Amino acid sequence: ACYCRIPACIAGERRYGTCAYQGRLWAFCC
Ligand SMILES: [Cl-]
C-alpha cells in the first residue's frame, strides 16, 4: 500500500513523488 513518509522510503519500497501536508514534505512511498 502507499504511505506518505518522512524522511524516506525503505528498501522494498520505491518513491513515487511527494506529499505536502501539515507544512512538511513527505516521500510518497509504495
Ligand atoms: Cl522527505
Author numbering: 1 to 30
Task: Please give sentences taken from the publication describing this entry.
Defensins are a family of antimicrobial peptides of innate immunity broadly active against bacteria, viruses and toxins. Further analysis of probable quaternary structures by the Protein Interfaces, Surfaces and Assemblies (PISA) software indicates that the HNP1 dimer forms a tetramer or dimer of dimers in a crystal.
The dimer-dimer interface consists of the Ile20 and Leu25 side chains and the assembly is maintained exclusively through van der Waals interactions. Surprisingly, although the asymmetric unit of the I20A-HNP1 crystal contained two monomers they were not arranged into a dimer. In the present study, we also discovered novel quaternary structures in the crystal, including a form of I20A-HNP1 that appears to be unable to form dimers or tetramers and a novel tetrameric form of I20A/L25A-HNP1. LF inhibition was less than 2-fold different than wild-type for the single mutants and about 2-fold different for the I20A/L25A double mutant, as measured by IC50 values. Since Ile20 and Leu25 function as an isologous binding site for the formation of a dimer of dimers, their effect or lack thereof on E. coli is not surprising, given a previous study of N-methylated Ile20 that showed that dimerization is dispensible for E. coli activity.
